[PDB]
Design a protein around this ligand. Sequence first.
Ligand SMILES: CC(=O)N[C@@H]1[C@@H](O)[C@H](O[C@@H]2O[C@H](CO)[C@H](O)[C@H](O)[C@H]2O)[C@@H](CO)O[C@H]1O
Ligand SMILES: CC(=O)N[C@@H]1[C@@H](O)[C@H](O[C@@H]2O[C@H](CO)[C@H](O)[C@H](O)[C@H]2O)[C@@H](CO)O[C@H]1O
Ligand SMILES: O=c1ccn([C@@H]2O[C@H](COP(=O)(O)OP(=O)(O)O)[C@@H](O)[C@H]2O)c(=O)[nH]1
Ligand SMILES: O=c1ccn([C@@H]2O[C@H](COP(=O)(O)OP(=O)(O)O)[C@@H](O)[C@H]2O)c(=O)[nH]1
Ligand SMILES: [Mn+2]
Ligand SMILES: [Mn+2]
Lengths: 287, 287
Amino acid sequence: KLKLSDWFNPFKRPEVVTMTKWKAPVVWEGTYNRAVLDNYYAKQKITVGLTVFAVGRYIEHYLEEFLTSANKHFMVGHPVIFYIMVDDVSRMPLIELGPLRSFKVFKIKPEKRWQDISMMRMKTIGEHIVAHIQHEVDFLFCMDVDQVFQDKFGVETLGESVAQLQAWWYKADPNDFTYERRKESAAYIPFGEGDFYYHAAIFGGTPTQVLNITQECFKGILKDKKNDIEAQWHNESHLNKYFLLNKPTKILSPEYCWDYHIGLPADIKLVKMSWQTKEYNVVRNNV
Amino acid sequence: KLKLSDWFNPFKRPEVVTMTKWKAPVVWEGTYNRAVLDNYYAKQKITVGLTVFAVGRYIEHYLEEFLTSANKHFMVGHPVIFYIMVDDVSRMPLIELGPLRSFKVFKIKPEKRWQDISMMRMKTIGEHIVAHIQHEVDFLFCMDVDQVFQDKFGVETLGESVAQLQAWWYKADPNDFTYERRKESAAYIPFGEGDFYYHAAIFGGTPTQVLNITQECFKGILKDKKNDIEAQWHNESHLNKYFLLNKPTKILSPEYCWDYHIGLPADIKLVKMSWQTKEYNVVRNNV
Ligand SMILES: CC(=O)N[C@@H]1[C@@H](O)[C@H](O[C@@H]2O[C@H](CO)[C@H](O)[C@H](O)[C@H]2O)[C@@H](CO)O[C@H]1O
Ligand SMILES: CC(=O)N[C@@H]1[C@@H](O)[C@H](O[C@@H]2O[C@H](CO)[C@H](O)[C@H](O)[C@H]2O)[C@@H](CO)O[C@H]1O
Ligand SMILES: O=c1ccn([C@@H]2O[C@H](COP(=O)(O)OP(=O)(O)O)[C@@H](O)[C@H]2O)c(=O)[nH]1
Ligand SMILES: O=c1ccn([C@@H]2O[C@H](COP(=O)(O)OP(=O)(O)O)[C@@H](O)[C@H]2O)c(=O)[nH]1
Ligand SMILES: [Mn+2]
Ligand SMILES: [Mn+2]
């Protein structure tokens, strides 16, 4: 049986938060023993899934860069399936995949508002988990397309439910977090509450956990609609409320999703994934 | 450990050849216990590969029908990877895949002669086995594109080296077989020799065996080129020579690759795959 101490050493990064009050690890560069985990998971013969949505001009701007870097860096040494959700398969970029990568593509309906395109992902991911993903993989990650893998993103990131620290807020106090603060929203988090500010651009877990994450978020999204309210940061608002009520068993450091517009401070030792520069004028078709 | 008698009962089909003189089974409808094999192989967590080439007009004519039918019928209930080799990846038709199916596509060089397009597959298959396929699957089939799955083609077909009985010749006397009969060819088989006439449209096995099948065949092809000779039926002449020397551990009946131009006689109880009708005038550009 795998124990935390087998692979995780918090003392290697004493200058950062490495453990939660519910005893979940926060995975920083230097703290993980990947060789130990690679072996353990190889014996279990795991497969890892990754979902990514590209609707509209997100395809031309981000899909190729995301997939090319994911092929190179994501869960290397283990079978991986990329689940690619696009509104137009004819614009799908043509890329060669390396050993232990395969893919499958689904044509989805494009929603009118980008806000709904972004939020409907929660419904769609859940449907695919029930239909097929639960039968195909042991762990799943669900990611935004507007980012690029920069270095190895491996088995150290795997857990039951996995959350990402948003790069701009990891050192901030909870009362400074851009949580949804309107009590009328299902995503509401009161001042005086909250552990961390999680980024919606990366989350994961077992198919069971990810289905619950996505079902609960989508229920909140739908309730808000009935109450004529839309959460400030959409999925992220709902995701943060979810991870407040149901604590993640693993958190990833901002090294796993870093914004270079911040610069590069001392705490960030080796970037695994970086944000693409925002291009809303082009890639979005409404305010 | 799996035994032949666990899943194979020759006495269900007494009117046809069910065993070879080297004690390999000839798999006919009614002889196999798929439920037993499905459970055995699921406990082993096997993955099955399938290679398919479509170069030139073979893409528009055959590829979509091949893949749609393969998704539906090939190794159902087990993870499958379709390996798709095309000269024009933009012409590759995209279909939705069901549970436990995924794929990956490779752009290949189109050879000038259709004879070399066909024969080069041996070299190309071998390269992919070494590069990735050996790490990805437990068993591999290699198939022509100009055919379509008609019913379940499952784990009853798996084995170390697997050969297909050519539908027109299965009852024929070996000295009527269209073996290469010129002693100058590497594919030469004399009169007085031969067990069966195997079809080049389907062959399989473990990546180790398939590599040896394809390397040996390609060496014969290249030797012939140095001697200014081309084997009468190309890959198939060489494949027949190979299986004479290195006997298949499993043979599939003509039910697994049936030509409806023959009609449907009593022996063919359930067709798993049918030949597409020959359209050489349109799909081939030389000789
Ligand atoms: C300190 C500060 O305000 N920094 C902001 C970033 O928060 C902002 O990133 C956006 O953050 C929201 C949640 O607040 C959400 O995660 C968005 O996806 C993300 O883009 C950034 C945008 O460029 O600007 C900084 O000034
Ligand atoms: C008995 C007889 O002559 N049958 C032929 C078939 O052999 C022939 O099929 C072709 O056979 C060659 C090997 O001889 C090779 O396998 C080809 O791939 C295959 O198409 C068929 C052609 O339609 O005609 C029959 O008459
Ligand atoms: O019109 C859209 C809007 C969003 N998305 C998907 O939803 C994700 C989240 O949207 P976005 O990245 O724009 O939100 P942000 O991170 O910028 O806040 C994107 O990465 C895309 O995968 C999309 O495909 N088309
Ligand atoms: O011009 C060609 C010739 C052949 N092939 C591939 O090679 C296989 C063997 O050729 P073919 O089926 O025409 O041989 P046959 O079975 O008719 O004798 C085909 O099924 C294709 O997969 C191809 O893609 N383009
Ligand atoms: Mn994003
Ligand atoms: Mn053929």
